[PDB]
Amino acid sequence: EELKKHEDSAIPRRLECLKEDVQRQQEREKELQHRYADLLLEKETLKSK
Amino acid sequence: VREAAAALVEEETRRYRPTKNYLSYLTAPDYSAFETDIMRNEFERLAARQPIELLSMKRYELPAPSSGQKNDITAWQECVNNSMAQLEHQAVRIENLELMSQHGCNAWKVYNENLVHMIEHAQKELQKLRKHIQDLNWQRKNMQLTAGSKLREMESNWVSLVSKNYEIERTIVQLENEIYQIKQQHGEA
Amino acid sequence: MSLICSISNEVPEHPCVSPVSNHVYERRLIEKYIAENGTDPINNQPLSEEQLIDIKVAHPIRPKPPSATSIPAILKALQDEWDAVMLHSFTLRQQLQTTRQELSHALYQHDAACRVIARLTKEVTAAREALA
Amino acid sequence: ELSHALYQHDAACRVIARLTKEVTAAREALATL
């Protein structure tokens, strides 16, 4: 009974941190891909010359 | 898997270091609460492991005073009294055996049944309890694996996302080197 | 239920229920407790002898065995049972004294485990920062 | 409370078991670069 309450404490904590880890990596992905998309576009300006 | 890991778990416990202000100051018991001094003397007696102060067997059998006492009428009187008491003890005993032969047979059967009834109630409560514990275990198991699936699913995504990101970072470097070179070649031209 | 008193863990001779806990009790014992403590014994809520609910169910209680017994033999057997009870009660003292040591040693190792977890949490986070 | 503390101690062992593997995989990950 006690163990379940500690598990009930642990499960949101594990969910909170790991989802935040995943979320930051997606935020990292969004920042990376935004720059990376722009630089090909920049390369196309160079290619246009 | 965990068998090997459990011995690896042990490692840091081997490296615990002098800090033993351990939590057992919480809710210290009391030895003393309702001890009488007589009970305390008995607990002193058992701490000293003292043998039994035997209740006298000689009263069962005493045929006469001792040789110096034998010249006292009152000493013989106490032994005559003693012999009188023992006969009545046998009288009360034989009286008890009369009842015990007829009724005690039935009463033993009734009492042995009552022990079975205590066991039947105990086994019912045990089977209630064992079921309830295993019902709890099924609540434990379902909760762990439901959460454990979704995290593992997320972790698989996370591993894929992490790997792909640095791959994109690698290609980012590939872009920047190539863009720079084209900028040099166009700039020199 | 074939009643057992909650204090003695054994069948009462004069039984009563505390309404403050619904447990079954041997009335002269808990009345003595009430006088000395003023509370229910199981949950420490306040209690009085007035609140106690009497039982008048007859006793099926049985000798153990009758064939040995006589007045000298009862006193002989009672002494042995008395010694067994005092051995039992002192064993509880011993048991309680023992549970002091084992709980305390367990608590140190679990407390020290937290310090390891703390260090490892730092280690993991630094390793994740390295991955960034 | 003893048994609870024992199981807490045992629960800690499972936590350390998880963490040991997680550290090992993360250091392995860094070795990949």
UniProtKB/Swiss-Prot annotation, chain A:
It is linked to A chromosomal aberration involving CDC5L is found in multicystic renal dysplasia. Translocation t(6;19)(p21;q13.1) with USF2. This is Cell division cycle 5-like protein. It comes from the Eukaryota. The chain holds residues 753 to 801 of 802 of the full protein. DNA-binding protein involved in cell cycle control. May act as a transcription activator. Plays a role in pre-mRNA splicing as core component of precatalytic, catalytic and postcatalytic spliceosomal complexes. Component of the PRP19-CDC5L complex that forms an integral part of the spliceosome and is required for activating pre-mRNA splicing. The PRP19-CDC5L complex may also play a role in the response to DNA damage (DDR). As a component of the minor spliceosome, involved in the splicing of U12-type introns in pre-mRNAs. Phosphorylated on serine and threonine residues. Has no effect on subcellular location nor on homodimerization. Phosphorylated in vitro by CDK2. Phosphorylation enhances interaction with PPP1R8. It is found in: Nucleus; Nucleus speckle; Cytoplasm. Transmembrane segments: none annotated. Ubiquitously expressed in both fetal and adult tissues. Disulfide bonds: none annotated. Residues 12-49 form a coiled coil. The lineage of its organism: Eukaryota, Metazoa, Chordata, Craniata, Vertebrata. Belongs to the CEF1 family.
From Swiss-Prot, chain B:
Residues 111-189 form a coiled coil. Keywords: Acetylation, Coiled coil, mRNA processing, mRNA splicing, Nucleus, Phosphoprotein, Spliceosome. The keyword Cytoplasm does not apply. GO terms for cellular component: catalytic step 2 spliceosome; centrosome; nuclear speck; nucleolus; nucleoplasm; nucleus; Prp19 complex; spliceosomal complex. Ubiquitously expressed. Belongs to the SPF27 family. This is Pre-mRNA-splicing factor SPF27. It comes from Homo sapiens (Human). The chain holds residues 28 to 216 of 225 of the full protein.
UniProtKB/Swiss-Prot annotation, chain C:
The 7 WD repeats are necessary and sufficient to support interaction with the RPA complex. It comes from Homo sapiens. Belongs to the WD repeat PRP19 family. Homotetramer. Component of activated, catalytic and post-catalytic spliceosomes. Component of the Prp19 complex/PRP19C/Nineteen complex/NTC and related complexes described as PRP19-CDC5L splicing complex and PSO4 complex. A homotetramer of PRPF19, CDC5L, PLRG1 and BCAS2 constitute the core of those complexes. The interaction with CDC5L, PLRG1 and BCAS2 is direct within this core complex. At least three less stably associated proteins CTNNBL1, CWC15 and HSPA8 are found in the Prp19 complex. It comes from the Eukaryota. The modification N-acetylserine is found at residue 2. Induction: By gamma irradiation and chemical mutagens but not by UV irradiation. The gene is PRPF19. The modification N6-acetyllysine is found at residue 122. Residues 2-73 form the U-box domain. This is Pre-mRNA-processing factor 19. It is found in: Nucleus; Nucleus, Nucleoplasm; Cytoplasm, Cytoskeleton, Spindle; Cytoplasm.
From Swiss-Prot, chain D:
Induction: By gamma irradiation and chemical mutagens but not by UV irradiation. It is found in: Nucleus; Nucleus, Nucleoplasm; Cytoplasm, Cytoskeleton, Spindle; Cytoplasm. Transmembrane segments: none annotated. Ubiquitous. Weakly expressed in senescent cells of different tissue origins. Highly expressed in tumor cell lines. It comes from the Eukaryota. The modification N6-acetyllysine is found at residue 21. Homotetramer. Component of activated, catalytic and post-catalytic spliceosomes. Component of the Prp19 complex/PRP19C/Nineteen complex/NTC and related complexes described as PRP19-CDC5L splicing complex and PSO4 complex. A homotetramer of PRPF19, CDC5L, PLRG1 and BCAS2 constitute the core of those complexes. The interaction with CDC5L, PLRG1 and BCAS2 is direct within this core complex. At least three less stably associated proteins CTNNBL1, CWC15 and HSPA8 are found in the Prp19 complex. Belongs to the WD repeat PRP19 family. The 7 WD repeats are necessary and sufficient to support interaction with the RPA complex. This is Pre-mRNA-processing factor 19. The lineage of its organism: Eukaryota, Metazoa, Chordata, Craniata, Vertebrata.
